Amino acid sequence: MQLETAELEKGLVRTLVDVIGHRLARDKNNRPNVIRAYPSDNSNDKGLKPDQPFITVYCQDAATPYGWVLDKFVEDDVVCYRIAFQIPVLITVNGKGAHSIMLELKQRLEMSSVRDLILEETGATVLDTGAIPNDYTYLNTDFENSAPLVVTLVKNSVLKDERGSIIERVIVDGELVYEEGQEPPEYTIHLDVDSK
Amino acid sequence: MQLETAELEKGLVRTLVDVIGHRLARDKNNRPNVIRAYPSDNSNDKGLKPDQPFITVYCQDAATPYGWVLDKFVEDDVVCYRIAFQIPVLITVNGKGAHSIMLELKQRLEMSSVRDLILEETGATVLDTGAIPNDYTYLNTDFENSAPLVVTLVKNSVLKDERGSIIERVIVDGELVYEEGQEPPEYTIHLDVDSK
Amino acid sequence: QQYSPKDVVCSWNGIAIEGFAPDSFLRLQRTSPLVTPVVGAGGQVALTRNADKTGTIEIELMQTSLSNQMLSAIQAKQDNMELEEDISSNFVIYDPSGSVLATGINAWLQELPQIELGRDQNSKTWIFGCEKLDYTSTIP
Amino acid sequence: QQYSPKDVVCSWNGIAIEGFAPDSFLRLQRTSPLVTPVVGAGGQVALTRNADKTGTIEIELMQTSLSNQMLSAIQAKQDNMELEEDISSNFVIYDPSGSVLATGINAWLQELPQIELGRDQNSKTWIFGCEKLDYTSTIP
Amino acid sequence: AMYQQYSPKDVVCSWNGIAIEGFAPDSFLRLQRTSPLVTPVVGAGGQVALTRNADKTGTIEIELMQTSLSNQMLSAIQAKQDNMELEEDISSNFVIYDPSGSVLATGINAWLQELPQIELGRDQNSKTWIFGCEKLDYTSTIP
Amino acid sequence: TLTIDGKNKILATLTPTTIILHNVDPTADPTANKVTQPVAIYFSEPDNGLIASEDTVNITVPASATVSHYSLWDANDKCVATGALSKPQFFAEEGIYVISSVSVDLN
Amino acid sequence: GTLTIDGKNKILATLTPTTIILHNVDPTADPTANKVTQPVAIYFSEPDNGLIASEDTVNITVPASATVSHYSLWDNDKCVATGALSKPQFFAEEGIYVISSVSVDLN
DSSP states (O other), X not given: OOOOHHHHHHHHXXXXXXXXXXXXXXXXXXXXXXXXXXXXXXXXXEOOOOSSSEEEEEEOXXXXXXXSOOEEEESSSSEEEEEEEEEEEEEEEEESSHHHHHHHHHHHHTSTTTHHHHHHHTOOEEEEEOOOOOEEEOOSSSOEEEEEEEEEEEEEEXXXXXXXXXXXXXXXXXXXXXXXXXXXXSEEEEEEEEOO | OOOOHHHHHHHHHHHHHHHSGGGSOBOTTSOBOEEESSOEETTTEEOOOOSSSXXXXXXXXXXXXXXXOXXXXXXXXXXXXXXXEEEEEEEEEEESSHHHHHHHHHHHHXXXXXXXHHHHHTOOEEEEEOOEXXXXXXXXXXXXXXXXXXXXXXXXXXXXXXXXXXXXXXXXXXXXXXXXXXXXXXXXXXXEEEOO | OOOOTTSOEEEETTEEEOOBOSSOOEEEEESSOSEEEEEOTTSOEEEEEOOOOOEEEEEEEXXXXXXXXXXXXXXXXXXXXXXXXXXXXXXXXXXXXXXXXXXXXXXXXXXOOOEEOOSSOOEEEEEEEESOEEEOOSOO | OOOOTTSOEEEXXXXXXXXXXXXXXXXXXXXXXXXXXXXXXXXXXXXXXXXXXXXXXXXXXXXXXXXXXXXXXXXXXXXXXXXXXXXOEEEEEEOTTOSOOEEEEEEEEEEOOOOOOXXXXXXXXXXXXXXXXXXXXXXX | OOOOOBXXXXXXXXXXXXXXXXXXXXXXXXXXXXXXXXXXXXXXXXXXXXXXXXXXOEEEEEEEOTTOTHHHHHHHHHHHHHSSOTTSOOOEEEEEEOTTOOOOEEEXXXXXXXXXXXXOSSSOOOEEEEEXXXXXXXXXXXX | OBOHHHHHHHHTTTOOOEEEEESSOOSSOTTSOBOSOOEEOOBXXXXXXXXXXXSOEXXXXXXXXXXXXXXXXXXXXXXXXXXXXXXXXXXXXXXXXEEOOOEEEOO | OEEOHHHHHHHHTTOOOOEEXXXXXXXXXXXXXXXXXXXXXXXXXXOBTTEEEBSSOEEEEEOTTOEEEEEEEEOOOOEEEEEEEEEXXXXXXXXXXXXXXXEEEOO
16 A cells, blocks of 8 residues: 555545534535545636535645654565655634534544544544644634644555565685685685575 | 765756656656756856646755764875765655655655665765655645655765875984983984885 | 665564664663773782673664564564574674674574553664674774 | 554453553563573673563553542452452453554552642553563464 | 573472472572592691592472472471381482583482471561482583 | 467467556556556457557546556456557646557567 | 566466477478477476476387487477477487477576
């Protein structure tokens, strides 16, 4: 499995539709309003703001606090590497009662279930979950209630080194001497070992 | 080898074309779009922004956290000095899916290969690699996705002191005395030693 | 060449070890000093050359590193062997920059790692002993 | 799989334990080292294989965690039993990522928790002993 | 080169057909001849002559844990031997098995000699048993 | 050394059926780095130990993607041939990459 | 442009030669000309790494006063391979020519 935030966001979006979809608004296709941040298509088209309440998913960054390389192994003749990653994600609810919805979303991510569905879709484990503020932003006319939350994930990624190769034959030479630097060696041992 | 960031940047640019050139856009000459930051020529000409996605390489600074002088030796009659340096570099991807490309670039700089090619071209070793944020900047009309990364390098530089000289002859004088300050010395030893 | 933490390779018992902790993932130390001076009441000095040359090797790995399973499996096998068979093996460390020029002649596993399960992933410390901690040189 | 603090499960005496402290809620450690080397005056080395294999298990819980009542009740029952009946029970720890592969063969409650009533809710530390702190491996 | 390793776990003692187990935390066995091999005599003029003592008896001391079950078996065996008639044999070979070769000796016609002093306190006190032997042989693998 | 008749007896059973395009060299691992969906391809019966495609194959490439190699797959999802394209081609927008012809040799 | 190991393994399974014949002239021409000995059965094993090897030794009776300088493999008769023997041999009288083992490769 390779690590790609584009897939983690999609998996989280698909999971949230079932986990917390009953509290959200629904579009013309009856689907709950969960979307990825900064919507756009065809390199210039821009999405419209859905009907409230809705959810936004945005991946912040990715780091490797756990060393630099976790494993190096051979799976088939191609060499492989494994690396441990950490990915903080930001989920926000916009509308009225955003805090009341974020609280229930928090209380469900900690269940034994749900954490299995997340791993089934994204193949990642939930590591931490931060606090929830209760924000108000003026916009125009009326304030909008919002409630962000940060959910950190952990995943292992594997890549293939197509430039690598393996050793399958070894040739060894040796000598024996009574004294250091004895120019004609007392004995010479030549060895050759094949994998087969 | 002397340390010059102008050459380190060129070596990194040449290496990246092969390492991560398959994910980038290509110009009229079919070359992947990798460039040095703040392009300019003839002291006033300014380069244009290439087609996305592309990469930018910019050397931040250079420091000497490892003492001040590493070695002092004589190679030929000219005296020599060796100094240890550290050079953080900044690589950014601009376009769509910048994070997805920076992740794969990270996962390749940690391989046993690639790190050999970097040393073959620039003659420097990779020391560290920082985290990758997921930035959005408005520009005009539409946001642009970007993903910076910091790769620190280590290199040793050697310089020639043309003002130096070596000692090849020594003249020594001595005295012996029963008591301190014996004005006529008991014995005098004169010695002269040549290199030849 | 110059030092970089991505080139260090450690090998013991035929296996390779990876997944080092971010910092302070290796330590070496002799047990006794090279010389123990003795000073008499009159100020005269005589030197004693210690025959002790053992040492200790401490290596830190990530909690989920695969090398942890290999070492535990090796340790488990040695608990079901007679005293006639041996357990020592050379501990070889390679570093292109020449920062660590040493190797354990006959190295044996000594202590099991301590385990902590705090918030974030922790490290595991393995301690090996050696009969002779050799300090080699790259210059004749 | 990869480590996450929400998957660790501890079971002793048939009950389950939850309400772990935010950080450093579990610790394991052997009592004695695997091998004690001995070095003679001439530099020769001989090894002693210790038969000791006991260990200690420290677990931290929140002050209001319900598991505190269960452990206190279990301890109270054992104070009113004759020496013929036993008090040991296997201490089993499960972790899907394989970070902690160990289990106490015969574990007995050893020390009661210290209590502090500062400003905010504090933690309680329970210490168990074991006859054999086994370190298992997931690889043959 | 390094010598063979010493492992207390693989040491087994036997006497009178029973196995003695439950060694104390430290110093759980001792062996000692009674008399020295040679007793030199020096005259006033400095001349020297050697006496070769024929005594070869010895003592084997073994120290067990306070609650070790082997304490019961020894007590029962000793109780049995108090009622036996003088013409019945009470001695048996004391055998020590040690794959590390650190112990070289064995007891020929060993007998129980002293009972253990019993002491109690907050901690646990080990119990010391003492045996004699007609001949404490010293043996080793041929060099 | 094989004769022409043996070569023809051999090539008739290769039966490549589809072609996929990659951006990384698929020689070491053909399962990864796919860029386009499988497309159908047809071949003629062997002669002189050689088989050639019977017609052109139009492949649609997604926008912003690159193609540098190819691979052929059997009727039972196994990779049997790999190779490199004439040029590494970058598609600014969705387009059609035209496969003029392809052949497999035993000579 | 090259066949993968899987393609070679699939390919070799179809070549199933079962007889071998010797000639005193190179059978690169009409393969049935200059035949010197009767056909002798020969077996081959499964293809591994794109190579097949003969299962067991084969004894061929060279008629008295004959000469052998070449050989050819036959299937259902089609000759699939040809080659030259290590040395032209003059069997002044009836004798035995031994083929220790022969293999076919695609590398």
